[PDB]
Every structure is written in C-alpha cells, then in structure tokens.
C-alpha cells in the first residue's frame, strides 16, 4: 500500500463464506520474519500436529 508506505495483507482468497463459528483465538506470531533479500546459514522450522 503506497498511501501507508507498507506491505498489507487483506485479500484472504482462502475461503469464500464462513458460518457456524465454534472457536476463535489470536495471539503472538511464532518464528517468523519479513524480508525479501537473500541470506546464508539460516534456520529450519519443524512442527508436529
């Protein structure tokens, strides 16, 4: 967004409609950054569900 001079994320194309909401939770982001450059000797993420 040029007006706010920052990157924004609002086009949530993932889903069309939402109904029958049963749970909602928001908290701090885990293990993320924000840069488009190139890096060397960085880290790996591993999750188990």
């Amino acid at each position: 967004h040029k007006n706010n001079k920052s990157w924004m994320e609002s086009e949530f194309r993932v889903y069309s409609s939402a109904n029958n909401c049963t749970f909602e939770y928001v908290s701090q982001p885990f293990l993320m950054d924000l840069e488009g450059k190139q890096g060397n000797f960085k880290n790996l993420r591993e999750f188990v569900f």
Binding site: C21, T22, F23, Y25
Partner: protein, 48 residues
C-alpha cells in the same frame, strides 16, 4: 459487553453471543442488584 451493551437488539432479530474458552463468574450476575427477574431451569445460580 452483552449485559452492559451500548446498543440494543430487536427481538425478531435476537442476537446470540457465543461464549467459550474464558473464565465464567456468574456470581457477578446475582450479586448486582439490577435484575428484577432471575429465573433458572434445570440449574441453580448458587452452584454455577
């Protein structure tokens, strides 16, 4: 936000608020001397 709500709801479009994953303290309800009607069915306010 439901009991002390700023705006009201029309009955034909009665609002419904879902409450989950948060501490419930129903003692705050009958301790507040602001409800002229308090009737329960299948449960008692004392044991809530």
């Amino acid at each position: 936000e439901v009991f002390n709500a700023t705006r009201f709801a029309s009955v034909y479009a009665w609002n419904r608020k879902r409450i989950s994953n948060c501490v419930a303290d129903y003692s705050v309800l009958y301790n507040s001397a602001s409800f002229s009607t308090f009737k329960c069915y299948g449960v008692s306010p004392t044991k809530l």
